[PDB]
Amino acid sequence: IETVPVKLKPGMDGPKVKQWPLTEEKIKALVEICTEMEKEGKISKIGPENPYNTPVFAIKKSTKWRKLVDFRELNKRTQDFWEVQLGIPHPAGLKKKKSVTVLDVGDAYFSVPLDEDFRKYTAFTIPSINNETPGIRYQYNVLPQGWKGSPAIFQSSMTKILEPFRKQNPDIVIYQYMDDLYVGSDLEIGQHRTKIEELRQHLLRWGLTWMGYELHPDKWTVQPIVLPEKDSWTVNDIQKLVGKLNWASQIYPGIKVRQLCKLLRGTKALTEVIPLTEEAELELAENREILKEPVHGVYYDPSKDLIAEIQKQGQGQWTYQIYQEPFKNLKTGKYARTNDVKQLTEAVQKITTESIVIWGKTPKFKLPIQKETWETWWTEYWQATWIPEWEFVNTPPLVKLWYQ
Amino acid sequence: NSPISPIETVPVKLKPGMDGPKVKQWPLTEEKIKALVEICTEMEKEGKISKIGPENPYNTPVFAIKKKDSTKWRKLVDFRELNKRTQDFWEVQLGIPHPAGLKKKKSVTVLDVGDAYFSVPLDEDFRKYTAFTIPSINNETPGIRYQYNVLPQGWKGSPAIFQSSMTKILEPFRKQNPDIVIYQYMDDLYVGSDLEIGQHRTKIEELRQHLLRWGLTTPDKKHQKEPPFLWMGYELHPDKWTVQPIVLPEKDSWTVNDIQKLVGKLNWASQIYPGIKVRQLCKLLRGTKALTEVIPLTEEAELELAENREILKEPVHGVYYDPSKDLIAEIQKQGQGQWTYQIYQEPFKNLKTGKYARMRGAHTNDVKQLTEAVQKITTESIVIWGKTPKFKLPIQKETWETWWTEYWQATWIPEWEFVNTPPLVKLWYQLEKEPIVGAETFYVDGAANRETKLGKAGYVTNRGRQKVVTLTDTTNQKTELQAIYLALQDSGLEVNIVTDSQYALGIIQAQPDQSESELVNQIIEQLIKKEKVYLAWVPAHKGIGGNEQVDKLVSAGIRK
Ligand SMILES: N#Cc1cc(Cl)cc(Oc2c(Cl)ccc(CNC(=O)c3[nH]cnc3Cl)c2F)c1
């Protein structure tokens, strides 16, 4: 096979990202895997004249260990290649299908050799414990899993592989994103599963083998901001409500509070009850209607990054919002049901998966957690083969209460 | 003289778009010129360098020095310019071994490699860039020109290429001797086995010989160092380790420099001597400073120092690591944001100790700090031992449970157990989930003028009270906290407070027990004394009753 030449975005050098410390268990697992990949020619040991590095991790995905390379940096620095030069167009139909199955096709890439002048940028290190040994250095000789360039390059081969199947099932949508195929149909679930098995057989002829089996995106609907319903309303309850309604108005146009504030006039004790006047009763009812419908004026812009915020609500509940401009929510949702970090990583993965399906992009996460805690623990429960961008924030205080 | 390894060379490049150095050789004394001719002549004989013509256009300055006590000359090459132009290499090591991570061995041998760098060849295509010139007596005739055949001292690539070369060389021996540990550090190898002395001293020789087959010379049985090994500020004995002796100076007048050097030594001692403190001594250094400027010790600083001397008066040692057993980590609060810890596998024989004394943010509490300390120790343990320890913490499971479930950040301590070692970690107050019936409701507010920095803080209450204090050189933030403080001062043991400051609410809802802000500390004092406090937020400038009135009241003279 002739290799596709790859050039970095002008002025950018390759990644120089340090390896996060690994437990013995994972180091040992990585050493087995890499020893075997070396024998098979997929990777080769490198010398110190290669100054690059990309972190590596071990995950379960099953009880078998899998190597997960964090190419987030290489991906940012090679964006012109995989997005503009060799972009994979994202089908709008995928999210409309009743069932979507996600298949791992990462092994496909290991039979295609990587441009020799690019290999150096895929350098990585297996560290040792207590800096006993210098630590084992490799680069890739073939398309590596986790690099967005790999599917960009394999795109032409994937099309040949899928051509018969597509031709025979023209109402099935197949989308490739990183190491995975997303396969959507409107069929009855048994028929759907049969066509998936059929697809597996096609793939098998080219040497290839927080979520249910399938995804059901047509059964994804919004989380309305919900206003409580009561017989008796205290000053506090109306205050709470007005605060909730107030913030809600920045997102939704038409939200009105005039009447509600009229009740609070004076310097009233918080516990004291205030019977609702008919105008207020009705103002409340009008807002209530507005919140059930979508946001007028808010549209996905492909030239912009997606952002995800998540809030811990207690009792295993987490809310989230995805937007490109603050308050211009494209999607909002809830995730439920361990410990906090486990739940959070589950939520992050589910939100990312929905994001791939809806837009063909992963969002940048604002995570309500301490950096080091996250960095220590996230790999223990991570099962995806991609990794989204993230940063760390302080959530508080009522952005929490304004949802759920 | 010495061998030069037949190991393959590492190909080396200049930074793309850069040519090699062409730095002008400055005229030298006859004395210096003569020394350099004798040195280089000898180095050429040994293979280390070679003569080249004037076709090679590259040059790097050369110097020579000889101390006034000595008669031996040394050559100094200034590779600054070549180093700019030489590619980046992979970093040598992520970290250095900690003694506490060493598994105990029956026998240990240290082997330093002689003339490490000069024993490794240099990429033939790159040698040209290492050119230098011994100049003529008064720079009249063309100088004598040389280039390096081996890794030069002071060149950017030598450390990395050496280590790389040592690794390749060691590989086969490792694969045939999996039981033997060999630590690589700089020119050194540290070699440990569980074999009996005889079979060890044999295996050392097989290694020394294997190393010699590849051009690397090492010391023999007679010249090999003996335990205790003194290494990087540590002492490594056969079944324990410690830090090298710490001399705590006595002084009438302490200079900044003396205190910096004291803190450093105490910090270094803290890895095995438990309970070391440096907070008060560090407080003295946070200022204009100046190395020779004497700083008088505060009473607290003197007491801290005295307590450390007591800790240090008798030697303490740590044990080595046994990978068949779990690690246990214990943490104690020492007060004033200071934490101390000990890690052992068998109580109470410590592998090592440490401290945590870090403010994360302006306002915090002991539960947050403890979690941070746990996180630091966990990372440290993964680095030193490749696994996390089981924890023993001075906090009830119930306190931890209440805190994590109600707090808004995700947080997770791995396997731990409560241990009753006071002071215990607790939360000192809690805010009500609901409005307090039969309690006065204070609507509070603050305002600050941006030009003048004058401010007003105040409240109105449902029982008809009001108050307004004036403030100078303040900010909006500060006035909002003052307002809350006022309401707490003038209220009974139960009170509902309504604010429009998300800033203040956020601080207070995290149940801080300590702050850099005096005002916040005063607010905390109050919150502890109260029986019940309910704190709520309303948006500002929406004419919400109670809020609109205190807003008019505190805006007067400050804002429209
Ligand atoms: N100098 C030095 C030095 C530095 C380091 Cl990091 C390690 C080192 O060797 C040791 C090795 Cl390779 C393993 C274990 C240890 C700990 N010491 C022993 O096991 C021991 N046994 C008999 N005498 C001693 Cl001392 C090493 F020091 C020696």
Ligand SMILES: [Mg+2]
């Ligand atoms: Mg205000």
